[PDB]
Amino acid sequence: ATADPVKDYLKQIGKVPLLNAEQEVELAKRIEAGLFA
DNA sequence: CCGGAGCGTTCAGCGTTCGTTTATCTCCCCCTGGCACTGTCATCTCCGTCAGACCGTCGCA
Numbered sequence: 001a002t003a004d005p006v007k008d009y010l011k012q013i014g015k016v017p018l019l020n021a022e023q024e025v026e027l028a029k030r031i032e033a034g035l036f037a
Numbered sequence: 038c039c040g041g042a043g044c045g046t047t048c049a050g051c052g053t054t055c056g057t058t059t060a061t062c063t064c065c066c067c068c069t070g071g072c073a074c075t076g077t078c079a080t081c082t083c084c085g086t087c088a089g090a091c092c093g094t095c096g097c098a
Contacts, residue, residue: 010078013078
């Protein structure tokens with residue numbers, strides 16, 4: 001919680017794992033499965 | 038010596054024309070939705086106030 005909240009938001013994004021092709025299509029399949037459920 | 042004709046004014050028959058509306062047809066404005074090689078972290082601030090106080094804050098003692 002500091003000034004210039006855009007920097008705090010960018011740090012809040014943090015080190016999230018980027019998605020390659022296989023992880024992205026697996027997540028899309030899980031998206032469709034959860035939607036169907 | 039009234040009588041008639043001509044003239045002034047004032048109204049009832051139907052006959053046309055207005056005053057104000059209505060739905061349909063072009064032209065335009067305005068808002069929500071589509072785009073499928075990939076493309077995954079910016080941005081320059083801020084200095085030669087200034088003058089000292091008021092105040093909380095904070096690590097050292």
